[PDB]
RNA sequence: CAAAGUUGUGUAGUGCGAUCGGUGGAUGCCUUGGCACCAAGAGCCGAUGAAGGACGUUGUGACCUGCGAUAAGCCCUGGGG
């Protein structure tokens, strides 16, 4: 899974929790990469892409491009 | 055999020719680059912060191109497969 437009079915607070969880996962991945672990390197970019998606949804809600749930 | 006389000279090197190579990158044939134009556009950008940059950004060392900590990319829409 890589997240998609179903993030628009979530609420603001749980989307922000999603942001925090994604940031923590990226932190762990970066530490693994530094320490020599993390064979799965593509996730290291996909997590940042997911953060971008969640910020996209939040900003469209904030700017009223899409009606806020 | 002696006497008198004649002629000859490449083991150092060199010249010329032929031949076989080396160096060199001319020539010929090209080209992801230029040059001069034609036709149609567009003729402004900027405090909603420009022109141009610095630094950063990739699974990984650099540089170029793109991008800006949402960082060779995020979303919507249409096309295409
Ligand atoms: Mg003209």
Which small-molecule ligands are present, each listed once?
A: magnesium ion
* Alpha plus pi helix count: 2
Number of strands: 0
**What portion of residues is helical?**
55-70%
* H-E string: HH
Q: What class would the helix/strand composition place it in?
A: mainly alpha
Report how far the terminal alpha carbons are from each other.
24 Å
Overall outline:
elongated
Number of domains: 1
The whole-angstrom Rg is 14 Å
Proportion of strand residues = under 5%
Tell me about the largest β-sheet: none
Pfam family, one: Ribosomal_L29
Keywords: Ribonucleoprotein, Ribosomal protein
Family: Belongs to the universal ribosomal protein uL29 family.
GO molecular function, one term: structural constituent of ribosome
In words, what does this structure look like?
With 69 residues, this protein is mostly helical. It has one domain (1-69). It is 64% helix and 0% strand. It has two helices and no strands. It has helices at residues 12-35, 43-62. Helix 1 (12-35) packs antiparallel against helix 2 (43-62). The longest helix has 24 residues, at 12-35. 7% of the residues are buried. It binds magnesium ion. It binds one RNA strand of 81 nucleotides through helix 2. The PDB classes it as antibiotic. Keywords: sarecycline, acne, antibiotic. The entry is titled "Cutibacterium acnes 70S ribosome with mRNA, P-site tRNA and Sarecycline bound".
């Amino acid at each position: 899974k890589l997240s998609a437009a179903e993030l628009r079915q979530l609420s603001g607070e749980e989307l922000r929790n999603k942001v925090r969880e994604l940031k923590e996962e990226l932190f762990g991945l970066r530490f693994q990469s530094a320490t020599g672990q993390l064979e799965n390197t593509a996730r290291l970019r996909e997590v940042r892409k997911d953060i971008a998606r969640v910020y996209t949804v939040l900003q469209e809600r904030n700017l009223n491009i899409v009606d806020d749930p």
